[PDB]
Amino acid sequence: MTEPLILQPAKPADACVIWLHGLGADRYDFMPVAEALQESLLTTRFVLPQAPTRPVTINGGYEMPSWYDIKAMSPARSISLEELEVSAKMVTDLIEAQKRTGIDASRIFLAGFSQGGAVVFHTAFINWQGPLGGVIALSTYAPTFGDELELSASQQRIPALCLHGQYDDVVQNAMGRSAFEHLKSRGVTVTWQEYPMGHEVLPQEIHDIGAWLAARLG
Amino acid sequence: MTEPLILQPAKPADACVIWLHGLGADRYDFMPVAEALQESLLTTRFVLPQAPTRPVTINGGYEMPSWYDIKAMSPARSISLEELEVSAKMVTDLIEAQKRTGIDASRIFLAGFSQGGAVVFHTAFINWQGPLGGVIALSTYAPTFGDELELSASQQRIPALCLHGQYDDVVQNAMGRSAFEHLKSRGVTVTWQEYPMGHEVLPQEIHDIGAWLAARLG
């Protein structure tokens, strides 16, 4: 286990975003983003975990950081559900590790990009039974959501922000919109934002995440 | 071993475009495209081959029309050179078949989308040592180009049009750009054209392909 990066904010922290990267990236991949946001969010810690290094099937069993195995791209994205739930258990330990440092669970947010986003959806709306600031889901999808999904009263009150490219060829705009629709139909305050890009992060998309966090925190 | 689609022009054919599909699609995928072009290109025949149905590793062995196997995506790509060559040798046979009907080589074009385009680069600029009207590459790249690429004087005379989406997440714009730069560095007449799309084909792109074709056969 590589330890997560902890980027300290300008003032003493009273909120926290835990941010998961996508397939094959490391804890640093989102450092420049966490830093852009800490320019306006003066009391919000960013905790950047790193996925276990493990074999990824679609990549010839190449070992690389990965939240769960992907075993097929087409026609059905076939994944390790067992590896996802472990990652999800990891993130829940993190939330608890952050509460112990004195951050109120209502001011902890989960963010995820791509493969990381799928672990953030499972954590907040399947595993987590407490307060929570928010979920921020970036160019992603919830492989573990389904018509049988049911949300407890607590999970219902976690706000979510779902962002996606129009031209994303890896995670289809629809797959990301299908996770947004699951939550919308179940009474979850949820926002949808699209941007003219592919499977990437844009400067304006980061501005909007800042605006959205600053609204939840104030 | 399915047979090619053959779309006869409005007037007696004196030209030909062999147009290959991408992974998982069939010979019918570009039939609407060929049809559109023929309404402007009155003596151009289009033969649309379909790739042999094979296990694909990155899709879990799922059997589907495939020009060559893809074994890994990241971070070192891996393809089957064996299957690429049999695809390439089958393309050549189709060129020799068109010649045999009474089309001049220099009026025959190769065109390819995604996986289809990698085979078409390889056939033109590595295998084929004779006259050829040109190569049209959509959303693709050259897996077999490298630092050691050297072209024959006749390979150098084959014109090319390379087209790409700015937001392609399956084959990066940068991977297409590199096929372009290898062709331009070796004295090939290449044209590059980018579009604000992903891994797909736009109306405006097909428009451009036609006007390129019109110029070439004028």
Curated annotation (Swiss-Prot), chains A, B:
It catalyses: a carboxylic ester + H2O = an alcohol + a carboxylate + H(+). It is an enzyme of class 3 (hydrolase). The keyword Hydrolase applies. The gene is estB. Belongs to the AB hydrolase superfamily. AB hydrolase 2 family. SUPFAM superfamilies: alpha/beta-Hydrolases. The keyword Hydrolase applies. Hydrolyzes carboxylic ester bonds with relatively broad substrate specificity. Keywords: Hydrolase, Serine esterase. This is Carboxylesterase 2. Coiled coil: none annotated. InterPro entries: AB_hydrolase_fold, LYPA1-2/EST-like, PLipase/COase/thioEstase. Homodimer. One of its GO terms (molecular function) is carboxylesterase activity. Its EC number is 3.1.1.1. The active site is at residues 114, 168, 199. It comes from Pseudomonas fluorescens.
